[PDB]
């Protein structure tokens, strides 16, 4: 069983940049007849993956010029010269020497752009959800770069942890952002029993975490 | 025109079985192997086996050996795949591919792909619920507000605001998996609080299984 390991997960570049992605197997691809056992797949998201590269370094037909690869043993690469805006997408490298066949990671290709914190807002449960028997309390991460960000939710100044769901939106097509919705679940006698409700977002823009909240009965 | 085209997505319960199919033209089937693929929802891609079509000869990945079972018909151009006790943790897409051998190895074309959402849920329309602030505040620019997509079954919702009128700003986030089988996600909108009382925000969420539709004015 080959292991297939890529690097880095994710990749932050700009249109025109030279995008270089790596792929390391765990043993030679080198086969008998002197050709590499290596595949490069591309995938957007909802889609089936697309064959760029047969045998490491061979151009799939139908695949953009501005793609080549190479790469000796066991450390691969796949470059993409003149980025397009096309080539956001995931890209996953796999081996077909041995079986199983194993895959990567998947290393993805998102847009490059400013930092940029995020606007947090909080929302309480409303009184139609309470007059149901839950209650679930909401956290926005409005606009934001990178997408690295951590949600911390407080109740009566305790640290939450597996009540909480989070949901990031993909890439802004044109302001290259994220978004992201933490949703914190408590059942109505929970919450009854609690009064502030703190959403803590801790994120490379902000200088120190910032934390937004609400005093239960209070709105 | 070479194409492998697969059977509709499907719903299954847990401890059932579901038999994809991949259906091969413009070229030779019994020239070129089938794989079969699947990749989980926040998953990379993972290899299930392959099976010569002029043969019926199957490989399988040890984790997939019982479950999983390829079949072809040769007479029919047909690739199956079919994978037993389904859990929840089988839901996920797949794929076939068919892997070109003549002068080289390459896994040039894949078919579009099959959903298997593997649950024990029922169609259930969702419950809307308004995402606002505790209490309006004049002291920030642009103000938050949305509405909760809560509990209901399958995908998917498609929430609007205004009936369309108000575009710019909005972000719906992907649905999530609740324990209970069912989905629930949020839709928010951003606009200047500067306009908060003489301008109505109301969210048109839709979800066709259930045939319903809801608008829900917010604060």
């Known amino acids: 069983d080959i292991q297939m390991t890529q690097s880095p997960s994710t990749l932050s570049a700009s249109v025109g940049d030279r995008v270089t992605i790596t792929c390391r197997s ?4 080198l086969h008998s007849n002197g050709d590499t056992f290596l595949y490069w797949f591309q995938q957007k998201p909802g889609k089936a993956p697309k064959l760029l590269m047969y045998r490491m370094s061979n151009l799939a037909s139908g695949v953009p010029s501005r ?10 690469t796949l470059t993409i010269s003149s ?101 914190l679940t408590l059942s109505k006698a929970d919450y009854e029993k609690h009064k502030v409700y703190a959403c803590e977002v801790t994120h490379q823009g902000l200088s120190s975490p910032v934390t937004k909240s609400f005093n239960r009965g209070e709105c | 025109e070479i194409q492998l085209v697969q059977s509709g997505a499907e719903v299954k319960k847990p401890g059932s079985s579901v038999k994809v199919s991949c259906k091969a033209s413009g070229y030779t089937f019994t020239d070129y192997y089938i794989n079969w693929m699947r990749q989980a929802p926040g998953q990379g891609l993972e290899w299930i086996g392959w099976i010569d079509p002029g043969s ?51 896994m040039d074309y894949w078919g579009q792909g099959t959903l298997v959402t593997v649950s024990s849920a029922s169609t259930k329309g969702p419950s809307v619920f308004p995402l606002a602030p505790c209490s309006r505040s004049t002291s920030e620019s642009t103000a938050a507000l949305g509405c909760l997509v809560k509990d209901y079954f399958p995908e998917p919702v498609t929430v609007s605001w205004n009936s369309g009128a108000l575009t710019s700003g909005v972000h719906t986030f992907p649905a999530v998996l609740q324990s ?18 003489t301008k109505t925000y109301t969210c048109n969420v839709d979800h066709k299984p259930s045939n319903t539709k809801v608008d829900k004015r917010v604060e």
């Open chain 2, 56 to 106: 019926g000869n199957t490989k399988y990945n040890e984790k997939f050996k019982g479950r999983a079972t390829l079949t072809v018909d040769t007479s029919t151009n047909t690739a199956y795949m079919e994978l037993s006790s389904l859990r929840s943790e089988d839901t996920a897409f797949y794929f076939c591919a068919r892997e070109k051998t003549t002068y080289y190895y390459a």
């Open chain 1, 26 to 29: 765990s043993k030679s691809l």
């Open chain 1, 83 to 183: 980025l397009q805006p096309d080539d956001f997408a995931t890209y996953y490298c796999m081996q077909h020497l041995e079986y199983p066949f194993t895959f990567g990671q998947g290393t993805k290709v998102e847009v490059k752009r400013t930092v940029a914190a995020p606007s947090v807002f909080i929302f309480p449960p409303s009184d139609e959800q309470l007059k149901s028997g839950t209650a679930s309390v909401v956290c926005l991460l409005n606009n934001f770069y990178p997408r690295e960000a951590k949600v911390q939710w407080k109740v009566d100044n305790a640290l939450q942890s597996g009540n909480s769901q989070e949901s990031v939106t993909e890439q802004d097509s044109k302001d290259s952002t994220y978004s992201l919705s933490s949703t």
């Open chain 1, 67 to 76: 793609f080549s690869g190479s790469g000796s043993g066991t450390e691969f």
């Open chain 2, 180 to 197: 209970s089988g069912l989905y629930s996600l949020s839709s928010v909108v951003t606009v200047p609080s500067s306009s908060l009382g």
